[PDB]
Design a protein around this ligand. Structure first.
Ligand SMILES: C[C@H]1O[C@H](O[C@H]2[C@H](O)[C@@H](O)[C@@H](O[C@H]3[C@H](O)[C@@H](O)[C@@H](O)O[C@@H]3CO)O[C@@H]2CO)[C@H](O)[C@@H](O)[C@@H]1N[C@H]1C=C(CO)[C@@H](O)[C@H](O)[C@H]1O
Length: 383
């Protein structure tokens, strides 16, 4: 009489054509734990959507699930994610950097097992740009076609952070609120208005299918996205043409400013409603184990977060793992775990309003107004 454990992860981890990592590792877990009498059912969902799927009704949701760490506070407030202790918590602390362990730590307790770092970087066509070119977005625009997903808040902030705008201070001070106000914010809005008015700029869509299609077309030669699309980018450009870089500078009023991505993690969480917590917690530990992370790298090129795999020669040589590490050290801010719901929501219509012909289009003439409107909406969402 097998007990069913329901596990949720993205399509790519359930796709046989990509080695179905999640199924493969669940089966390995079962083989390693003969004392458990279990079978698996799988629910396909992007880590980006996990909060929405689970918090709607945690008791109806999967027992074990893969999510993005910025979702942690909403999951906790929904009683949708179990605190982890014991060997599992110890592994999260011992096998990760301090910042990666912090991605899943709330009020001093560990709530999930990281399996990869979570950030974004630049894919580009080596036929169009040199290594030197891609150090500057402005240089890039003179040589070829550049895209950016401006209606996706996870990407938008990099431009505002570049000029000293802040979210919760350093990211950990709720009392600091949002600060996108003033000339520092308007200067960034003006830069983005100019970008949209640049005929070598093409807005990417929210989840980046437009950019991917553009790379294949040649209509887009630079794509800001992540590790999950590595194989598709290789398909679009041809692997000898794929360049991978950390983030460029943008020139605001004569000053080179560094774009800064969010850096968080993707992790495995346990549903408190799972009827076998022993199995669920051990499975989460297994899915984030060293062996499992190495398999994620070999089966579909996903970069490990486990610091012991950093010295694996194949990992260290991987262009995406290397870019992600450079974004971590040089081009990022730590992903807040203070809930950013109001920002994720406001970011999308704000980004969309830059488009030529948009309702309430952001322009040079109204940039300051629109910037304050945005700052005001962000802070209102905290009241
Ligand atoms: C807006 C959204 O931003 C963040 O989501 C990003 C993920 O963290 C990234 O990992 C990446 O997701 C990819 C998966 O890693 C990958 O395995 C595959 O499934 O494709 C995903 C991309 O399609 O990119 C995501 C951004 O595109 C953040 O983690 C996430 O929580 C944010 N979602 C909020 C935003 C809205 C609408 O504004 C709400 O509906 C959500 O409930 C919020 O959580």
């Amino acid at each position: 009489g097998k007990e069913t454990i329901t596990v949720m992860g993205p399509a790519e981890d359930l796709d046989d054509a990509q080695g179905a990592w999640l199924k493969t590792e669940c089966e390995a877990f079962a083989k390693a734990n003969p004392d458990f009498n279990i079978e698996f059912k799988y629910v396909t969902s992007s880590e980006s959507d996990a909060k929405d799927v689970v918090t709607k009704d945690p008791k109806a949701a999967a027992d074990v699930y893969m999510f993005a760490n910025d979702q942690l506070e909403p999951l906790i407030k929904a009683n949708a994610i179990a605190k982890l202790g014991g060997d599992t918590a110890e592994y999260v602390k011992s096998s990760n950097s301090e910042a990666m362990a912090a991605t899943v730590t709330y009020d001093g307790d560990i709530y999930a097992v990281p399996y990869t770092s979570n950030t974004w970087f630049m894919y580009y066509d080596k036929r169009v740009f040199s290594e030197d070119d891609v150090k500057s977005l402005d240089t890039m625009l003179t040589k070829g076609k550049v895209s950016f997903p401006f209606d996706n808040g996870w990407y938008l902030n990099a431009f505002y952070a570049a000029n000293g705008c802040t979210i919760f201070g350093d990211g950990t001070d709720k009392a600091a609120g949002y600060d996108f106000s003033g000339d520092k914010g308007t200067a960034v809005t003006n830069y983005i208005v100019d970008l949209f008015a640049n005929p070598n700029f093409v807005m990417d869509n929210n989840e980046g299918s437009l950019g991917l299609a553009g790379l294949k077309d040649g209509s887009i030669n630079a794509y800001f996205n992540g590790n999950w699309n590595y194989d598709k980018v290789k398909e679009a450009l041809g692997e000898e043409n794929v360049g991978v870089a950390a983030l460029p500078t943008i020139n605001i009023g004569g000053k080179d400013c560094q774009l800064k991505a969010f850096l968080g993690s993707k992790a495995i969480g346990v549903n408190p409603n799972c009827k076998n917590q022993e199995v669920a917690v051990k499975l989460a530990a297994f899915l984030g184990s060293e062996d499992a992370q190495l398999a994620h790298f070999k089966l579909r090129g996903q970069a490990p977060v486990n610091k012991d795999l950093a010295t694996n020669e194949e990992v260290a040589a991987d262009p995406v793992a290397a870019a992600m590490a450079k974004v971590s050290s040089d081009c990022s801010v730590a992903q807040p775990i203070i809930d950013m719901s109001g920002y994720w929501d406001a970011a999308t219509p704000f980004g969309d309003a830059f488009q030529n012909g948009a309702e309430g289009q952001i322009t040079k003439d109204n940039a300051a107004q629109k910037t304050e409107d945005f700052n005001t909406q962000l802070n209102d969402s905290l009241k």
